[PDB]
Amino acid sequence: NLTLNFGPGVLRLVMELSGEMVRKCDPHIGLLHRGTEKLIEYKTYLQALPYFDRLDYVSMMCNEQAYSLAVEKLLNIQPPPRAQWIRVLFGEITRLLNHIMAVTTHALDIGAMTPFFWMFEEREKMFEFYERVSGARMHAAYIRPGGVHQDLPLGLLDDIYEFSKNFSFRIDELEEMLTNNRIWRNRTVDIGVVTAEDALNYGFSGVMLRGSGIQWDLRKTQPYDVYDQVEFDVPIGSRGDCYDRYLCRVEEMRQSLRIISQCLNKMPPGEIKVDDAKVSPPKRAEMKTSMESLIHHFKLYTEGYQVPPGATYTAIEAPKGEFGVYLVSDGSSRPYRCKIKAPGFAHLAGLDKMSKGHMLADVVAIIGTQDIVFGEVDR
Amino acid sequence: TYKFVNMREPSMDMKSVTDRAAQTLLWTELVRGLGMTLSYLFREPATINYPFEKGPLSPRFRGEHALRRYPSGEERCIACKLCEAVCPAQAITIEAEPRADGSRRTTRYDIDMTKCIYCGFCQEACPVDAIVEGPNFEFSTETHEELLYNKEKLLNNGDKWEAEIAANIQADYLYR
Amino acid sequence: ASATRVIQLLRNWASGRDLQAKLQLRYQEISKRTQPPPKLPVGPSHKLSNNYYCTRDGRREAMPPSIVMSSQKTEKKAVTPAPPIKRWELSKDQPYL
């Protein structure tokens, strides 16, 4: 029984092995603990928004939406319909980015590196969409607790449509490389099997549930924004292993394309942030012409808006699973407490059970199928 | 509604079993993957010829910071400290006093570029469009010290980039 | 794409798909980088009359949570937190992959 400390995303893993078998796997984390939750207590809500971009870096837009939903619930306001549609469209784009990252990396670690490049070209195109809508490629801060910061430029919808009508062929090429390959199946089939009861008790969420046959998806069960106005299917696994989760993720990307199509065709007119200048800042022209607009701009950018006292737990169906925020407001313009719930935390806590009686090389596959991003896990 | 990803049962007739045996022995799907790679070899690559060719950008893109001025040549900044107040990283340091002619102007305006997160909150909090995030992104440095911008550096950046900055603002200001 | 016909045929046969219909390189089909100005309409609160803020004040309608069963101060049918969730339907678009 030999003990190996595979040290330095960045992960330290202490294992005891009996021969080739993995007897015990112990992850040591905190190599990316930056104390986000303590730092948030020294910021206004607007000032605290950009930390959520950095929490789960792979899918920045979704974290913005979760934080904005929590703050909106505490504020007792609702965003305008066009803002909600933009939020859902960019959340599905965000899902595609996360899925491409998760699938390609899983394949790359497994030793297949070709689809990483093939799909990172598409990732670059989606980064272009991000940059055109917000000015930043990845750390966007676009989705705000009153709606969105800016309206779409006049040619963005057409370019998104042009991109999205060619992506299914890219997914088909990825599948041609992966799904029926016997080496890929031997690397993934019957690896990291988790039962439904164990997945529920261990706090798993997202695909980590749906690969075991659990029919659960927050966008269907507890819809937020306009997800109740779009039609899509929830892919469900049957064996609870890595292969079924890969299929579910691939299927999810196709579903995301479907939802993006619906969002494009049903984008409504109107304003992009709530018409309430005590929450959302006014327009520049109004700020430079009206006394009330200038006062509200000054106060919203110096003190910030006050949130009525209370605590909420708001969760959304993130690309990596259920992503949640427990937000406690004391009545001032700075949050009293912000606890961030990350799906990867519970998934990595379950890695020990998932890797019981497997090869050392199976641990890499299980880590890849758990979809672990370190920034969210450590916070 | 929901979908099954892996709920297919293989056929057990002799023809299907022989097809699967032929796949097992003659390596058919591996040849399919080889064909996919071969097809990808013969298409045009997506590489651009940097630095002679550049990636696409938007008027909304946020780059190196700059301090702008009015067409008369007087600076726009009136030392309200709204950008300093809103800065999520506390990267802005401002000190101000009345000028020799009584104007409300800054004597110190520093941005720690190694603390900045390039969020652009300062340029949207500014009431007079004084601090902006200009289009330049190629300003890497050999030392940490040259990334601690004072007021002179930011005014020089503004005078250097004003043409492009004003064009970008003209393009994007109707969205703000 | 500036590709010869023979190379197009070879890549089409190798992949098994028609590449020309769905190319991964952008061309003139994308939008112009110079666009006309927008107009960006205003929201529902931009009225000149009948627009008192007290009638559209979301933050001031928030209240402290309702208290049921403070400890310090009949058939009785049993209840559940919410009604049992209905089972899902099997996607009559492509039920099986």
Binding site: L157, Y161, K165, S168, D172, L257, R258, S261, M267, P269 | - | -
Partner: peptide
């Protein structure tokens, strides 16, 4: 005077977008 102009889908909507898996069988017994 001038009417509203923002980014909207074209009249009649956009064309259909493929999303189903396409893995054709080349064909050989």
């Amino acid at each position: 005077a001038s009417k509203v102009k923002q980014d909207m889908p074209p009249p009649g909507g956009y064309g259909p977008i493929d999303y189903k898996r396409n893995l054709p069988r080349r064909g050989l017994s």
